[PDB]
């Protein structure tokens, strides 16, 4: 059994997302484009975190 | 009846085809991709997993010398270490007090953790492809599975589908697959029998069962300590642990295309790549002569609101006179707008509403209705929204298809500017005539 | 939610609450009788 993280706080702009990140433990966050060029990141999360992707 | 279409390999949007059977009834096809599955064929190298060193005890001689024989073990050193003075918890070993040996033994083997934990390296080389797909076939819901490679055919409502091939041969996974329990790696592992110490594939096994191993450990015997009797060694660790702790994101985290990535089997799930054609025979029975479905005239288009977006933003609104009460298709004449209905209920003279989306700012199209077109034309207005979570229901707008109808400013540019060339081609033209007419 | 302010009132005493905490109740594991929820942690103890 694994936990799963608590729900992040979406907010929207101009072909941006801006994701208000409270991880407990060290979260593994996580993007990649679904198109040609995935360009996957990754980034670990341990406190609380603000990303625009 | 034979119908050839092509639908977009997108998974979850669908997609409506109109099979047009002149003095027939035409019909409408919405079909949606739930799932396309390619499932490549792999064929098996070596499994990778953590080895043990299996160490005999130590063989202490005194007044004498020990000598081993070279053994034909996966990874196998002998060592005989001179004047050592081993110690119990009692006192010395012997009585012997210089010139005592010690042999010391070592090899490598698969550890039994190796029935589960290990990691696969495969070779993949195609991909069969598989698909679900979901037809409204006369307003009924029915869903079907069938391979996508363009043999196989489905039955459904006596009505039969042909999907695939799938016009793209692109797959997430290149030739060489890693599989460790759900996580697809794509890398280069190294051949059998070239593995190195401390990397991936220090110990090999062509099966899980196989009793050949390939082992590459730099193990190294060391001399014991003074006065002890234990057998240190010097081996670099496993290369399975270090690729575990090292491993990066697998396949179903950095796929292209978007894919999901399942293992057991390897399968890549909904990739959005390409196309895929779809052949569909329909019997005789299944059409309905124009005479007996309702026919609509004096059929007028009015749009009260357009807006743009993903969703299906747009409402159009018609004016119809129905012969006779019955249910009549919709289709899109255009590929730059979506309608989301497929068939209405008319009767009488009435009107209808139906729901489109569209990415054109000036949304000018044609509907049909029982074989009766009808000209739509309307200003679309920008959605307020930035973001959402579905992909978007109408096609992107191209080369040909653009511009708004605020284009009257290019159209007058451009003849302003055609008539300022004009007037100066006709002055030279004029000079032109005067001097070869002169002489 | 999450941030200074995701519960006001206007004195210590009074009974006035307002709370924005991103408040979510998740469906309870098989087999279990406990109330999982997803909330945003307390904005006044991260500000601290
Ligand atoms: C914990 O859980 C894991 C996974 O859930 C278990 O591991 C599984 O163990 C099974 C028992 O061995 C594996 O099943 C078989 O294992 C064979 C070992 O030799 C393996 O070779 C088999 O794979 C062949 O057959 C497949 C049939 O579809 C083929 O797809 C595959 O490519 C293999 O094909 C062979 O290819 C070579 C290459 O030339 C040929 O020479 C052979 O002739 C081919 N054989 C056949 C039959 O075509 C088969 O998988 C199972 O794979 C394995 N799981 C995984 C993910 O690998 C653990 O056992 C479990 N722990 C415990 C304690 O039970
Ligand atoms: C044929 O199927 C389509 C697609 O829906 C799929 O098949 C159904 C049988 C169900 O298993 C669905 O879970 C599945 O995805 C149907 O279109 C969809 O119908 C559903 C309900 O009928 C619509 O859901 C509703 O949406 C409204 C608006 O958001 C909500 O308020 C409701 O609470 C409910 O969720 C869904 O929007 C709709 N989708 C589209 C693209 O039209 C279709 O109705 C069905 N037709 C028949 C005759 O069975």
């Known amino acids: 059994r694994v936990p799963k993280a608590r729900n992040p706080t979406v907010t929207y702009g101009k072909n941006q997302v801006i994701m208000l990140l409270y991880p407990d433990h060290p979260t593994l966050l996580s993007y990649r484009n679904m198109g040609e060029e995935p360009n996957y990141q990754e980034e670990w999360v341990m406190h609380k975190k603000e990303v625009v992707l | ?439």
């Open chain 2, 1 to 439: 009846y034979e119908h050839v279409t092509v639908i977009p390999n997108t998974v979850g949007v669908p997609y409506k085809t109109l099979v047009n059977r002149p003095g027939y009834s035409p019909m409408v096809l919405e079909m949606e991709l739930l799932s396309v599955t390619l499932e490549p064929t792999l064929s098996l190298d070596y499994i990778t997993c953590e080895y043990k060193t299996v160490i005999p005890s130590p063989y202490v001689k005194c007044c004498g010398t020990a000598e081993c024989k070279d053994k034909n073990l996966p990874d196998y050193s002998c060592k005989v270490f001179t004047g050592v003075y081993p110690f119990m918890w009692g006192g010395a070993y012997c009585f012997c007090d210089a010139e005592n040996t010690q042999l010391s033994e070592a090899h490598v083997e698969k550890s039994e953790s190796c029935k589960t934990e290990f990691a696969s390296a495969y070779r993949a080389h195609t991909a069969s492809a598989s698909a679900k797909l979901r037809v409204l076939y006369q307003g009924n819901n029915i869903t079907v599975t069938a391979y996508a490679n363009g043999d196989h055919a489905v039955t459904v409502k006596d009505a039969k589908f042909i999907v695939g091939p799938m016009s793209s041969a692109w797959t997430p996974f290149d030739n060489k697959i890693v599989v460790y329990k759900g996580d697809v790696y794509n890398m280069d592992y190294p051949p059998f029998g070239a593995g190195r110490p401390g990397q991936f594939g220090d110990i090999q096994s062509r099966t899980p069962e196989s009793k050949d191993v390939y082992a590459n450990t730099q193990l190294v015997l060391q001399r014991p300590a003074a006065g002890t009797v234990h057998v240190p060694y010097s081996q670099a660790p496993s290369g399975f642990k270090y690729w575990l702790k090292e491993r990066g994101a697998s396949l179903q985290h950095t796929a292209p295309f978007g894919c999901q990535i399942a293992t057991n089997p390897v399968r890549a799930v909904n990739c959005a790549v390409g196309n895929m054609p779809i052949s569909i025979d329909i019997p005789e029975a299944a059409f309905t002569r124009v005479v007996d479905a309702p026919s609509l005239t004096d059929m007028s288009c009015e749009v009260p609101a357009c807006t743009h977006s993903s969703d299906f933003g747009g409402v159009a609104v018609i004016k119809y006179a129905a012969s006779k009460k019955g249910k009549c298709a919709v289709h899109s004449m255009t590929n730059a707008v979506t309608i989301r209905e497929a068939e209405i209920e008319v009767e009488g003279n009435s009107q209808l509403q139906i729901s489109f989306s569209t990415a054109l700012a000036s949304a000018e199209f044609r509907v049909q209705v029982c074989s009766t077109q009808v000209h739509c034309a309307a200003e679309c207005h920008p959605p307020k929204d930035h973001i959402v979570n579905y992909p978007a229901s109408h096609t992107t707008l191209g080369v040909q298809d653009i511009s708004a109808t605020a284009m009257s400013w290019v159209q007058k540019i451009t003849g302003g500017v055609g008539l300022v060339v004009a007037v100066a081609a006709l002055i030279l033209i004029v000079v032109l005539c005067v001097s070869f007419s002169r002489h």
